[PDB]
Amino acid sequence: EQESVKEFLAKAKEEFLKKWESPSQNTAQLDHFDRIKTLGTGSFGRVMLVKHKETGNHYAMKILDKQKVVKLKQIEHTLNEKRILQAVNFPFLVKLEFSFKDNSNLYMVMEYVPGGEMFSHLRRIGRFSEPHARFYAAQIVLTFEYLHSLDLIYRDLKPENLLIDQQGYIQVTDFGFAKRVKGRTWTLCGTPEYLAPEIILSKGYNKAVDWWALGVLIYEMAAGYPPFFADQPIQIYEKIVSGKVRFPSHFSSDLKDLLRNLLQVDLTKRFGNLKNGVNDIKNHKWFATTDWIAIYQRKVEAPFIPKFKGPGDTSNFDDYEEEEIRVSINEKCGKEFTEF
Numbered sequence: 001e002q003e004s005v006k007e008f009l010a011k012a013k014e015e016f017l018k019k020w021e022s023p024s025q026n027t028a029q030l031d032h033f034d035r036i037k038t039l040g041t042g043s044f045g046r047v048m049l050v051k052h053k054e055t056g057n058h059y060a061m062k063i064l065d066k067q068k069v070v071k072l073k074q075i076e077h078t079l080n081e082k083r084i085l086q087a088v089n090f091p092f093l094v095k096l097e098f099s100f101k102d103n104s105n106l107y108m109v110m111e112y113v114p115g116g117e118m119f120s121h122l123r124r125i126g127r128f129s130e131p132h133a134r135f136y137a138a139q140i141v142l143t144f145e146y147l148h149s150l151d152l153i154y155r156d157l158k159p160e161n162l163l164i165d166q167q168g169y170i171q172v173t174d175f176g177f178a179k180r181v182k183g184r185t186w187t188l189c190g191t192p193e194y195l196a197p198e199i200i201l202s203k204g205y206n207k208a209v210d211w212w213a214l215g216v217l218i219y220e221m222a223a224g225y226p227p228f229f230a231d232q233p234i235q236i237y238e239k240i241v242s243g244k245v246r247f248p249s250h251f252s253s254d255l256k257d258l259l260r261n262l263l264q265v266d267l268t269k270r271f272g273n274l275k276n277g278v279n280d281i282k283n284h285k286w287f288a289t290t291d292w293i294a295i296y297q298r299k300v301e302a303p304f305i306p307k308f309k310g311p312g313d314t315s316n317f318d319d320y321e322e323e324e325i326r327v328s329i330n331e332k333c334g335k336e337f338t339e340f
């Protein structure tokens with residue numbers, strides 16, 4: 001397709017490109033915030049809940065150690081992440097509010113989403129019913145239609161990266177592997193359980209890898225566990241490239257048919273990567289009850305609302321050792337991060 005969708009995406013690309021070509025920089029500093037709690041950690045950064053001292057607003061602050069970014073070969077990826085986040089705008093993406101750097105670290109200050117990760121709720125309940133999984137899946141389909149139209153690939157879809165907001169809708173966080181890509185790209189990155197066969201085989205790959213990952217996510221939401229799993233990654237990779245996938249008997253026939261077309265090992269036959277693009281997915285029988293405009297407008301009542309007391313409640317996140325945010329007397333890796 002309808003002209004309203006075509007015109008929506010043309011305007012979205014226009015607005016993205018203006019920010020992409022003139023990124024914002026240096027819009028706050030560390031001592032504007034009080035530190036509250038660590039919400040998660042990793043090899044080269046962590047995420048902390050903070051409170052802005054003048055306004056009282058809460059935020060999730062991602063802190064990356066510049067020297068560890070360089071050593072783990074993530075320079076280009078960290079520059080991709082901040083440039084993309086400062087340029088996008090869509091209902092189901094977390095908003096970037098501030099960014100800045102100092103002698104030691106890079107900082108990205110995001111909206112705080114207090115309901116926690118979809119992964120926690122999935123494991124507490126066991127599995128989601130098909131209507132519940134389908135509500136979340138429709139939001140990811142729309143978000144990928146938006147990102148792919150901007151020539152972006154997301155490359156890290158998994159339940160840990162989908163936060164649940166106060167109204168029960170998804171907010172996608174972590175753009176650490178996202179990239180603007182005209183054609184193909186080649187980096188090995190992602191989480192093993194979610195990787196498409198063409199990534200594992202070191203091929204040049206495209207946006208079809210996000211549609212494969214959506215197949216893995218929908219299977220995991222409806223079954224309670226992902227389709228390909230093992231103790232060592234090499235064993236996971238062998239199952240993925242065979243693509244041999246068994247479905248629980250409680251799966252509907254429509255769900256199995258959709259999953260066979262998303263978890264298609266031949267990328268030239270995979271739903272989302274054919275001539276009709278995303279409409280092969282939106283028009284599939286498993287989505288026949290979905291009102292796509294109502295989801296986009298956030299007019300559907302959600303299947304589940306998280307329990308929390310207020311905008312600063314951390315009870316839906318877990319506990320980590322609290323470490324210092326040190327800032328060196330001397331500047332580190334200045335050249336490498338000039339554009340940040």
Ligand SMILES: N[C@H]1CO[C@H]2[C@@H]1OC[C@H]2OC(=O)Nc1ccccc1
Nearest residue numbers: 012089090091092093094095111171
């Ligand atoms: N979590 C982000 C995204 O929604 C919130 C928040 O940031 C401000 C507000 O932004 C939007 O509602 N964005 C939008 C709306 C319609 C079409 C395209 C983009």
Ligand SMILES: N[C@H]1CO[C@H]2[C@@H]1OC[C@H]2OC(=O)Nc1ccccc1
Nearest residue numbers: 119158159160193225226228229230
């Ligand atoms: N989203 C989580 C779960 O899948 C990914 C990711 O974390 C690592 C990996 O974990 C599993 O494959 N879990 C599993 C496998 C079989 C039975 C029960 C659980």
